[PDB]
Amino acid sequence: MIHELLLALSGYPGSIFTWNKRSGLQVSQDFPFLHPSETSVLNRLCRLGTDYIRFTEFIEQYTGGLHGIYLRAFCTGLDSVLQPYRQALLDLEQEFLGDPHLSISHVNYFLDQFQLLFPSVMVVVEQIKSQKIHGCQILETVYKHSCGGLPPVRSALEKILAVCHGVMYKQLSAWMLHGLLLDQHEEQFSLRVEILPSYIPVRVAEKILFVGESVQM
Amino acid sequence: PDDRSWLEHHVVHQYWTARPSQFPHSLHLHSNLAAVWDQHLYSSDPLYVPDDRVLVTETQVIRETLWLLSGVKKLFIFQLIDGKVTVRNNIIVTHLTHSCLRSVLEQIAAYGQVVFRLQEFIDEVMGPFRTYQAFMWALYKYFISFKEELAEIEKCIINTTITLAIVVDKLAPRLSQLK
Amino acid sequence: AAAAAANLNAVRETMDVLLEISRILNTGLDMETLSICVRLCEQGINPEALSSVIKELRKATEALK
């Protein structure tokens, strides 16, 4: 009970809260050993764990469709944001070891901090999945949503975006020093709008092209 | 009597040797979940349909699964079908309503198959190519260091409680490279 | 016994609870002094009396300073 739900919110569904691709973690089971209003509290609670499971599914499908070095970078930070949600579950279980007189509302109250982060990061993932954004414009749609308006989603995507720049900081180091272009294919030769983010000005790319091409001569 | 009595008392011997559990239970729903599930079944009027499992606590399963992940074979948990490990469902812990437990052990078995096939290949060179031979030694070199960590962790059980969520999240940076 | 020692666990629990209650009121009491006055109130005593004597003896480090 006080670990059953705490595995339901993690990657396991249980038969209590049945999984569905339409919408998972649905209570349909009726318990005479619960107050009838507990279903609504669990219904509030299941929305967060559904998002966590969906985030796991996206990593499962990819670590010809969605592919690229940015796509092997965007999923990686999505691990990193989920880690306090793991630690914050371990603390819950440690609480429930000593005092089992806490209720579902305590768990919801404790994981209310993830009801500002997770819903607003969920939509970004669905936008990137439904559209076929797998070039370097994924950094744009992260940066389009990282400005935010809620501080928790402001700090999350900031981390996620940063590693992407660190990937492109490795492509632009081989190019300007060793003279290697086509270190990563798309999604003479030059940078175009697909492999260029929309907040680097156009002049800088021409300067970079001059710098990289002059090395070979 | 005098050694069997010591066995019964001071050794476990209650699922891996068939002698149903006398583990002390202090009931009340967080761990009386099987009984409340049976009463709920009765209120839904099944009628009777009785399931038979051997009733273990959780931690023994954890040590067995860590043994499975280390690379040894032939354990009591996880029935083996044709060479592939598969979760057995004749084993119950009181809570987790017997359906979560199936899923968690099936995931650990899904990793155990990957470990088993590689160790099977390594065993099949022990009973001129010389490149296969250089390949299995490097695989083995990963495996011995990999076994070291889990063997360390299992010692700390004897000396503190450890749950499933600990052991799955602990092995993330290894199951990453296993894929 | 065994159930007689889980009670000793349980009074240790409450006295760490009372220890936090002592620390966030910014009292001069620690756990050990608290452990004496609970025994005194188990024998029965006015807390008005004990507060007065503690407010006196804390001024006795000031009478020798």
Binding site: - | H25, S26, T161 | -
Partner: peptide, 23 residues
């Protein structure tokens, strides 16, 4: 005497067939 009994070590292995406050 309470502080004398107090210095003992307590088990931190909690049961899963007794989750609700075992000894």
């Amino acid at each position: 005497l309470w502080e004398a009994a107090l210095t003992y070590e307590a088990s931190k292995r909690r049961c899963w067939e007794r989750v609700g406050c075992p000894p």
